[PDB]
Design a protein around this motif. Structure first.
Motif, PDB file in Angstrom:
ATOM      1  N   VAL A  16      42.030  47.559  43.168  1.00 17.02           N
ATOM      2  CA  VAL A  16      41.645  46.153  43.168  1.00 17.02           C
ATOM      3  C   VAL A  16      41.745  45.526  41.784  1.00 17.02           C
ATOM      4  CG1 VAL A  16      39.872  44.517  43.862  1.00 17.02           C
ATOM      5  CG2 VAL A  16      40.004  46.728  44.998  1.00 17.02           C
ATOM      6  N   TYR A  17      42.373  44.360  41.723  1.00 14.98           N
ATOM      7  CA  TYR A  17      42.519  43.626  40.481  1.00 14.98           C
ATOM      8  C   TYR A  17      42.064  42.188  40.687  1.00 14.98           C
ATOM      9  CZ  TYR A  17      45.742  47.474  39.430  1.00 14.98           C
ATOM     10  OH  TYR A  17      46.296  48.710  39.210  1.00 14.98           O
ATOM     11  N   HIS A  18      41.994  41.428  39.600  1.00 21.97           N
ATOM     12  CA  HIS A  18      41.748  39.995  39.706  1.00 21.97           C
ATOM     13  C   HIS A  18      42.649  39.248  38.731  1.00 21.97           C
ATOM     14  CE1 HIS A  18      39.818  36.069  39.384  1.00 21.97           C
ATOM     15  NE2 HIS A  18      39.326  36.307  40.586  1.00 21.97           N
ATOM     16  N   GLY A  29      31.645  42.198  44.283  1.00 21.53           N
ATOM     17  CA  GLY A  29      32.000  43.298  43.401  1.00 21.53           C
ATOM     18  C   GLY A  29      31.453  44.636  43.879  1.00 21.53           C
ATOM     19  N   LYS A  30      31.133  44.723  45.166  1.00 25.36           N
ATOM     20  CA  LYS A  30      30.503  45.924  45.717  1.00 25.36           C
ATOM     21  C   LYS A  30      31.451  47.113  45.677  1.00 25.36           C
ATOM     22  CE  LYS A  30      29.585  44.050  49.683  1.00 25.36           C
ATOM     23  NZ  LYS A  30      30.370  42.823  49.397  1.00 25.36           N
ATOM     24  N   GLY A  31      32.704  46.889  46.063  1.00 24.06           N
ATOM     25  CA  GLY A  31      33.698  47.949  46.030  1.00 24.06           C
ATOM     26  C   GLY A  31      33.927  48.475  44.621  1.00 24.06           C
ATOM     27  N   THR A  32      34.007  47.555  43.673  1.00 14.92           N
ATOM     28  CA  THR A  32      34.252  47.892  42.280  1.00 14.92           C
ATOM     29  C   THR A  32      33.116  48.749  41.735  1.00 14.92           C
ATOM     30  OG1 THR A  32      35.504  45.839  41.934  1.00 14.92           O
ATOM     31  CG2 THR A  32      34.624  46.942  39.949  1.00 14.92           C
ATOM     32  N   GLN A  33      31.882  48.354  42.027  1.00 17.36           N
ATOM     33  CA  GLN A  33      30.725  49.093  41.535  1.00 17.36           C
ATOM     34  C   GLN A  33      30.573  50.435  42.238  1.00 17.36           C
ATOM     35  OE1 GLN A  33      29.317  48.415  38.812  1.00 17.36           O
ATOM     36  NE2 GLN A  33      30.315  46.416  38.555  1.00 17.36           N
ATOM     37  N   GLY A  48      41.283  35.062  43.657  1.00 24.50           N
ATOM     38  CA  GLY A  48      42.022  35.719  42.599  1.00 24.50           C
ATOM     39  C   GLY A  48      42.170  37.205  42.842  1.00 24.50           C
ATOM     40  N   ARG A  49      41.658  37.685  43.970  1.00 26.79           N
ATOM     41  CA  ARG A  49      41.737  39.116  44.241  1.00 26.79           C
ATOM     42  C   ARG A  49      43.153  39.541  44.613  1.00 26.79           C
ATOM     43  NH1 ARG A  49      37.437  42.078  48.038  1.00 26.79           N
ATOM     44  NH2 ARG A  49      38.471  40.928  49.744  1.00 26.79           N
ATOM     45  N   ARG A  50      43.614  40.609  43.973  1.00 27.35           N
ATOM     46  CA  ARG A  50      44.914  41.188  44.266  1.00 27.35           C
ATOM     47  C   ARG A  50      44.723  42.681  44.420  1.00 27.35           C
ATOM     48  NH1 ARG A  50      45.155  36.599  44.613  1.00 27.35           N
ATOM     49  NH2 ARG A  50      46.569  35.087  43.606  1.00 27.35           N
ATOM     50  N   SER A  90      26.917  38.327  39.287  1.00 31.70           N
ATOM     51  CA  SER A  90      27.769  37.279  38.721  1.00 31.70           C
ATOM     52  C   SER A  90      28.206  37.594  37.300  1.00 31.70           C
ATOM     53  CB  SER A  90      27.057  35.923  38.737  1.00 31.70           C
ATOM     54  OG  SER A  90      26.102  35.823  37.691  1.00 31.70           O
ATOM     55  N   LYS A  91      27.581  38.603  36.706  1.00 32.72           N
ATOM     56  CA  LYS A  91      27.853  38.999  35.329  1.00 32.72           C
ATOM     57  C   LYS A  91      29.154  39.795  35.267  1.00 32.72           C
ATOM     58  CE  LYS A  91      23.907  37.350  33.815  1.00 32.72           C
ATOM     59  NZ  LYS A  91      23.796  36.327  32.738  1.00 32.72           N
ATOM     60  N   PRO A  92      29.677  40.044  34.049  1.00 33.81           N
ATOM     61  CA  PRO A  92      30.873  40.886  33.923  1.00 33.81           C
ATOM     62  C   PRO A  92      30.649  42.310  34.436  1.00 33.81           C
ATOM     63  CG  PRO A  92      30.526  39.633  31.922  1.00 33.81           C
ATOM     64  CD  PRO A  92      29.305  39.428  32.760  1.00 33.81           C
TER      65      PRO A  92
END
Ligand code: ADP
Ligand code: ADP
Length: 203
Positions: free
Chosen positions: A133-135, A12-16, A123-125, A188-190
């Motif tokens: 980025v989605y899941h 989740g590095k990109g997302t954060q 599940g990455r899309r 690993s958390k939301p």
């Protein structure tokens, strides 16, 4: 402030990084995103890098180091997202920064079990146009938006990417720990809970 985000693919590095960059005023430097652009554009970097990326291997250090030298922001806050990925890259980064009287301020380790990494990558899309980025489970795309599954997010390549991370990138945990700058994130958390932790360790 200069930050490094470190952790396995899918953590989740990109997302954060995108969230923190937008909200707190950081320049977001993603070697993955920049490499992808180079590949799309057919530059000498892109043409060379493509082979490694498709196999789930790291792109050779000299190429990455040159890339970082070319894009490194003069002034302002920076998030290095997915760079360094090797000890040689980290050594080059430290030398670069030293010549400018700068240093990495915090390295955030995004900890997440392999089982979760695999679920996240499978599940990455992505919107291939925009890079968004989605899941399929955790953040499904809207129906109106075209998405693809990255070829390197297929089971075989995910397996390779994780092995490569453990062999070449995980030693950076100790490299940065011994500098006194490593911070642990339970990745690993939301998404919202991870972001709260990110904000905590840099303030
Ligand atoms: N905390 C989270 N919980 C569940 N899914 C997440 C979380 N963070 C990111 N994701 C999803 O997991 C996948 C990996 O996220 P990404 O930011 O691309 O990781 P990285 O940049 O570390 O490879 C993406 O599909 C994203 O939508
Ligand atoms: N710092 C780096 N050093 C070497 N190769 C890199 C680096 N960053 C990205 N890559 C290459 O780009 C590929 C895709 O990276 P990225 O887009 O960040 O996907 P992920 O977030 O799943 O790792 C990597 O598997 C690797 O081949």
């Amino acid at each position: 402030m200069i930050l490094v985000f470190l952790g396995p693919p899918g953590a989740g590095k990109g997302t954060q990084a995108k969230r923190l960059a937008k909200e707190k005023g950081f320049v977001h430097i993603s070697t993955g995103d920049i490499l992808r652009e180079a590949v799309q554009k057919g530059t000498p970097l892109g043409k060379k890098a493509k082979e490694y990326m498709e196999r789930g291997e790291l792109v050779p250090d000299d190429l990455i180091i040159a890339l970082i030298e070319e894009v490194f922001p003069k002034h302002g806050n920076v998030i290095f997202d997915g760079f360094p990925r090797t000890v040689k890259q980290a050594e080059a980064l430290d030398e670069m920064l030293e010549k400018k009287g700068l240093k990495v301020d915090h390295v955030l380790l995004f900890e997440v079990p392999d089982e979760v990494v695999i679920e996240r990558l499978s599940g990455r899309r992505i919107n291939p146009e925009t890079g968004e980025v989605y899941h399929v489970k955790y953040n499904p795309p809207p129906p109106g938006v075209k998405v693809i599954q990255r070829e390197d997010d297929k089971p075989e390549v995910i397996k390779k990417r994780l092995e490569v991370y453990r062999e070449q990138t995980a030693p950076l945990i100790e490299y940065y720990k011994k500098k006194g700058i490593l911070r642990i994130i339970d990745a690993s958390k939301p998404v919202e809970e991870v972001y709260r932790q990110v904000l905590e360790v840099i303030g």
